[PDB]
Design a protein around this ligand. Structure first.
Ligand SMILES: [Mg+2]
Ligand SMILES: [Mg+2]
Ligand SMILES: [Zn+2]
Ligand SMILES: [Zn+2]
Lengths: 24, 593, 595, 25
């Protein structure tokens, strides 16, 4: 009886202009 | 031996892994699969597993008697967390003979596994217990004789706790007498402790299964509650399809569907009036309910409701449910959806594009056009990307357009709304494909990418002198039809640039207001400087930006379409007028500076 | 050796298991944790893992140029499932010199692993490839010299596919030099193939992680969409809180809260005029909007909105969204919710039960009473159990009452609706505790189970010589208060039995109709014979069954409350009257059976 | 160099009748 603890694309012009209109 | 010990350990781990990764199932099912799949690698004559009840807290109506003193306080065994030792299920695997397996829900204390206190003690303290000559020890009072009618007797016990990550104990895996006459040695202690640690980590997969089933149930409840809030009530339907007040019929619709067609065709506005055939259509003098009546009329006018025998009440409920699915945001509300659907109908009928598409294709186009911005929150994809909205985590690119597609297909998925119920499968796939194409084509980045392909189509089509050759050339190839589809969807969504100046000024103010509310939110809650288009401080710069919006986006679409069909020639002409008006507002501002 | 490789294998399994069972994460994160934690057991000077792009189909706009013929068809390497060999990410674990973990998103073909075709060939075929003396092979252009100027030279390569259970490949793990300089042997093949099979099974946890994040995002979107449909629009607020029409502000609620209090106190009807105090209150003359206005008045009348500074607009919009949260079912609609809330207010005020409850127990009691059957589908818990509705799998016992509690808490979570803004955390915890106590009380079963305890409380209090002793004896112990609260909620839930005959008549026909529709659903969908209570053909059996309802269920709680407080004496008296009426109708049915 | 195919193969007794009759349980 032993008890243990658990172990534990876009073009350049598109790439510029699309940013101003928030299309990206 | 040690090689055999590790081969057993590694095999145990691998087959328990295989059976936890076969299917996400409950704790009982996962341990049944693992233990029964590792039945050979345990190499015990018998073993059992008992799972403890997980109720850490009692419901208040079960705790009242304790506080009132009507029932004496429970004294005796308690887990280290404080839960009561209550085995709610035992699964016994009898491996000594006949290979029997039994499941005992709610085992009594008479059960031979619970007759001895050793699982109860293991639940009390979470110790690993190795017990040699179990009936000879006086504490747990094991069965000295045969356990049952079979001549099987307990000789050794190897009881281990399964531990949840919160250090709560979840079950007791009681491995009985070894196949060999040897006691459990520390090598078998190590094997079984490894098994129990893996099982305690597979408790993650069980917890994730239970969490996922709760998430799925909560999602389906939330969708059904949303469906009830969104679906047109019977009075909302009856406000349009006035069968009661004209046919003299009760609430149950037992009328002939042809009679419902007759009674609705008198209740819908005449398509020649209210300019439902014209590009100059303005929805401002019409209420949203009048727009619903118009949209039902437009579905009639392509002559599809009768040709495919789709029910009238389903169509009316679908239209009203679409109206309710649009929010009350400043510009991307139901008015924008109906203006796009009307522009689609006008492109089909007046633009003479109908000669390129079937009846079913036109029906799909008009239904997709009405739903193209359903449930728009009023913020562009940029705000979803920056605020990390659940939409942006769900849909990667074209976030809102994918949301509008998914929601309109969910609306079509309900049979009380499904206008496509009476059509054959392959037609259902065709209409769903055209729905997806049309809705996803409303992302402007996609349009910008495909401008060149559409222009190459138009340049190729201008070279033929006769209409019959042009229709044969386009209608043979599906892809050319899909490009015309995408550019029709973009030309309809941006149609307000083509509307007369009186309409355009107010719509441009509405768009500017929605963009200023967008910028307000990004400044207030995100601490970012808005773009001058979305900056309210640059209100006075609004007309100049409109000129750029005309000079950069829409003019290409309407040039290519005015080349492609002379009938769409007035639409570009209105765009040009609107540009001149914005020019009269831009250079005055340079005179004010 | 054999023992060493088996212990190494099993510890690979154990650490990969631990790191996939630490938390659910994507393919990159799980393989990062598992591989980096197994760095000591993979005897490799370097190794890397490139994950293939999983997009098996492409969007139509990307397929257009190929079908149009503008772009030539892709000819070259393809996975066995037919996808393109495109590695979207590489993670290099350099271990021979300085340990470093280089993440290369979208590695170009210039990447020292991809300049040789062997990952591409493994993605093309799914073959396990072991290769020795890399400069000598002619088919694969592996580097003959230093590769990163550090003098590290590729000598051996062991490339394996990771395979999803569908046989679709997900990534290529490339294990380089064997340290000992020996070629890869069948033992090290066995170790690496074990690792890669475990990783391919561990792909289930990533699969689930994406699935649950999708389910979570869809749930949160569905809840927010439901909140938009359910929350009162500002027009619905203005229909009650007519600040525009009298303060002449017309734009924003920039006026002081005392102005909103005055403008609402004049708009809400007087509780004496509309019988809001009496037990005999009937909602049939009032419209549901008038019930909203009465409910806001009832929250004013307990004098709690002013005491705790509940914002008037927030109270008004929480009462309108509560009204909108009820479905249009025949009996468990908003009207029954308001009748329970009004009966609760009547118990507090006219029943003189407030003597046992503080003002943060009457406030929470009334707010829970108004919401006790919010979003009722129209079916009892038996239909939920039998049809196996998502409610019955979500809530095990007291299915609908737990749903009504969860939804009322979800309404209170929004700051735009929260009447409990200006309370302390411990006060909010108290209010939430009494919300659960009052909402889960309404299941009839629990009532039947706790009748004994409430009877013992009332019998003990009847012997008390003075009022002050009984009040102190109740208010000392929290549990006795909770029992009285639960039986107050049940007595409000059944209050229709105590209404006058006209009300009881109609409301009983409504209850019978709802039960008949529920039983028609049971007969049509489940193919079961309904209980005669739920059978339309036993319509003529309704009155005598209603008699059985009176003397079995309600009469106990109303007798115990009539003993407890004399002011609740008339409520039982109405129940007795209703019993006589239904009994006469049952005798007429007996006459029909007598001929 | 060796190339190989992937290996993959409570309640009273009287109360019960009334409780069932009214759909409580
Ligand atoms: Mg849109
Ligand atoms: Mg209820
Ligand atoms: Zn749009
Ligand atoms: Zn109720």
């Amino acid at each position: 009886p032993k008890f243990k603890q658990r172990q534990t694309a876009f073009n350049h012009l598109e790439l510029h202009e699309l940013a101003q209109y928030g299309i990206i | 031996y040690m090689y055999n010990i590790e081969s057993r350990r590694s095999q145990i781990l691998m087959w328990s892994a295989n059976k936890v990764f076969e299917e996400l199932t409950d704790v009982e099912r996962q341990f049944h699969k693992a233990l029964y799949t590792v039945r050979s690698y345990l190499n015990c004559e018998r073993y059992s597993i008992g799972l403890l009840d997980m109720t850490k807290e009692k419901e208040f109506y079960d705790e009242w008697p304790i506080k009132l003193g009507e029932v004496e306080p429970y004294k005796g065994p308690k887990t280290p967390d404080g839960r009561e030792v209550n085995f709610y299920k035992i699964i016994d695997y009898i491996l000594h003979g006949k290979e029997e397996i039994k499941v005992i829900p709610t085992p009594p204390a008479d059960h031979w596994t619970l007759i001895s206190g050793l699982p109860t003690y293991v639940a009390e303290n979470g110790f690993i217990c190795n017990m040699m000559n179990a009936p000879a020890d006086e504490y747990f009072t094991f069965q000295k004789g045969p356990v049952d009618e079979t001549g099987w007797v307990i000789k050794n016990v190897l009881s281990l706790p399964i531990v949840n990550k919160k250090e709560d104990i979840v079950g007791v895996a009681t491995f009985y007498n070894r196949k060999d006459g040897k006691p459990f040695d520390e090598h078998d202690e190590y094997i079984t402790e490894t098994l129990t640690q893996f099982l305690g980590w597979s408790l993650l997969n069980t917890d994730t299964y239970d969490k996922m089933n709760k998430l799925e149930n909560r999602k389906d409840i939330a969708q059904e509650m949303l469906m009830n809030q969104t679906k047109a009530t019977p009075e909302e339907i009856k406000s349009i399809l006035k069968f009661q007040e004209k046919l003299n019929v009760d609430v149950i619709d037992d009328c002939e569907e042809k009679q419902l067609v007759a009674i609705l065709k008198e209740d819908l506005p005449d398509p020649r009036s209210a300019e439902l055939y014209e590009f100059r259509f303005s929805d401002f003098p019409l209420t949203e309910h009048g727009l619903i009546k118009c949209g039902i009329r437009l579905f009639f006018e392509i002559n599809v409701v009768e040709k495919f025998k789709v029910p009238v009440e389903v169509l009316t409920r679908w239209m009203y449910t679409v109206r309710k699915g649009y929010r009350a945001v400043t510009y991307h509300n139901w008015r924008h959806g109906f203006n796009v659907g009307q522009t689609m109908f006008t492109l089909l009928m007046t633009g003479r594009l109908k000669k390129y598409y079937t009846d079913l294709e036109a029906f799909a186009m008009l239904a997709a056009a009405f739903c193209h911005d359903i449930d728009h929150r009023g913020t562009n994809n940029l705000y979803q990307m920056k605020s990390t909205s659940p939409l942006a985590r769900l849909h990667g690119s074209s976030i809102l357009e994918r949301h509008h597609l998914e929601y309109s297909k969910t609306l079509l998925q309900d049979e009380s709304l499904n206008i496509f119920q009476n059509l054959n499968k392959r037609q259902f796939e065709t209409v769903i494909h055209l729905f997806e194409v049309a809705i996803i084509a409303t992302d402007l980045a996609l349009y910008f990418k495909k401008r060149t392909m559409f222009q190459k189509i138009v340049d190729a089509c201008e070279q033929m002198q006769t209409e019959e050759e042009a229709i044969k050339y386009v209608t043979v190839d599906p892809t050319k039809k899909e490009i015309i589809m995408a550019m029709m969807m973009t030309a309809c969504d941006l149609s307000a640039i083509t509307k007369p100046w009186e309409v355009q000024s107010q719509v441009a103010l509405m768009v500017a207001n929605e963009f200023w509310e967008q910028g307000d939110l990004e400044r207030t809650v995100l601490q970012q400087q808005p773009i001058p288009m979305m900056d309210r401080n640059k209100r006075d710069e609004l007309p100049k930006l409109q000129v750029g919006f005309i000079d950069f986006v829409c003019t290409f679409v309407y040039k290519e379409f005015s080349r492609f069909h002379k009938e769409i020639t007035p639409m570009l002409s209105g765009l040009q007028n609107n540009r001149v008006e914005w020019k009269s507002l831009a250079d005055e501002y340079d005179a004010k500076m």
